[PDB]
Amino acid sequence: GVFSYEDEATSVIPPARLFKSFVLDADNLIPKVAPQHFTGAENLEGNGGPGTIKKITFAEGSEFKYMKHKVEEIDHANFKYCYSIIEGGPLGHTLEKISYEIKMAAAPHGGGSILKITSKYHTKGNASISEEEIKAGKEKAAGLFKAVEAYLLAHPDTYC
């Protein structure tokens, strides 16, 4: 079964800089912003553009866990950024794929931004999606999104 879920999240980061950070620097941004929650991330394929693969990694209790996120599309006109689980352990075993789309928008105050995000859970066979799996997907992304603001306010000499 195909299951799409969309959210908007507010950021203190400006809309093009919100976009630019998650496309140009994410491999370093993950352990920059949350070094106990993630061990790091590494380029396995491409050049940071479409057809890129990021091996994203955590242990958080020393039990090592991995994802591979294929960057499928990057669109600088829309400031849209699309990737999926081509891999995330059990997300290949009873799920098959997770189709992401990060889209920026303006904040109403014009200071920071609104992050818009789709995550699309593809389940194997007739399997219904777990609410706890929908939550597990959101919480790692929302973890990094709140952590990059806290990082950017703690270490402001980055231009992003």
Side-chain angles (χ1 to χ4, degrees), residues 6 77 79 108 113 115 129 144 156:
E6 200 181 327
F79 294 145
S113 63
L115 180 139
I129 196 67
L144 291 168

Side-chain angles (χ1 to χ4, degrees), residues 21 32 51 68 72 74 88 129 152:
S21 299
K32 275 175 169 180
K68 286 175 291 180
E72 300 197 66
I74 282 170
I129 196 67
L152 182 143

Side-chain angles (χ1 to χ4, degrees), residues 34 43 49 51 56 61 68 79 89 95 100 102 110-111 114 119 121 140 157:
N43 182 265
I56 300 173
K68 286 175 291 180
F79 294 145
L95 281 84
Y100 276 95
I102 294 176
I114 292 174
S119 180
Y121 304 79
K140 265 70 185 305
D157 288 269

Side-chain angles (χ1 to χ4, degrees), residues 58 65-67 85 87-98 122-124 133:
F58 59 104
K65 291 294 185 184
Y66 319 126
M67 321 292 284
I85 275 58
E87 145 72 26
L91 311 182
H93 306 164
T94 189
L95 281 84
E96 52 167 66
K97 196 186 302 302
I98 314 286
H122 291 264
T123 70
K124 293 187 173 281
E133 192 71 73

Side-chain angles (χ1 to χ4, degrees), residues 2 19 52 94 155:
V2 186
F19 171 78
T52 285
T94 189
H155 312 286

Side-chain angles (χ1 to χ4, degrees), residues 76-89:
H76 278 58
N78 291 310
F79 294 145
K80 185 183 294 208
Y81 167 42
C82 303
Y83 55 93
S84 51
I85 275 58
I86 58 162
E87 145 72 26

